[PDB]
Predict the structure.
Amino acid sequence: SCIQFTRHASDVLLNLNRLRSRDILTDVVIVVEQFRAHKTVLMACSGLFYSIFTDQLKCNLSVINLDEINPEGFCILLDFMYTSRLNLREGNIMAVMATAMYLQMEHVVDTCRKFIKAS
Amino acid sequence: SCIQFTRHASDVLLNLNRLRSRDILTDVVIVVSEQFRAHKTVLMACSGLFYSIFTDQLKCNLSVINLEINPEGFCILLDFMYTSRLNLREGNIMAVMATAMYLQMEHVVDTCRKFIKASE
């Protein structure tokens, strides 16, 4: 019985992005500058954040210090995680690609290769 | 400056489902009549009821929200919230439609009705 709401996955994500704007139930700050977010959204999108939050040995912490990753490159990936929309310019594209491979977003890393080899 | 990944809302939802499926980072027990583990964030994104509940300071930051509602009808809607699939059947359709209203979910309600008046 598959009455698929192909809009409902994206409704959910837009609604998660509003909660972040409204600051409703953010349970983490990532420092790179300060970026507030939901651990669950980070986890679903990013192999490393998922790799961090699932480690039963590590402390569960409301603050996560990223090691010099581009803050610009992280703000663009963050907004992607919440909007599905990847902003790339020539002036930031290198910033963005880097942070992906570290964040382990394997489909986001391929997307930067194509836009860089372009033009 | 606007490259949207059209399978990405959907990958986010299935990864959120697997978290729920592994009981990872879930922060609320919904006690329906049975228990249901889920994440506040997702309930609030799908439900105006759960939205009102979790933005109330008097009932923040409660771990347990006891809702009488049917469990099976809740279970199928909880499935829907995390999977975008609505699993309807003559035997639950009345149960889902009802839970649906009480949750203020109207898009699936419409769907139950039309399933009801499609067979009969």
In short: The longest helix of chain A spans residues 8-21. Chain A has six helices and four strands. The two ends of chain A are 47 Å apart (CA to CA).
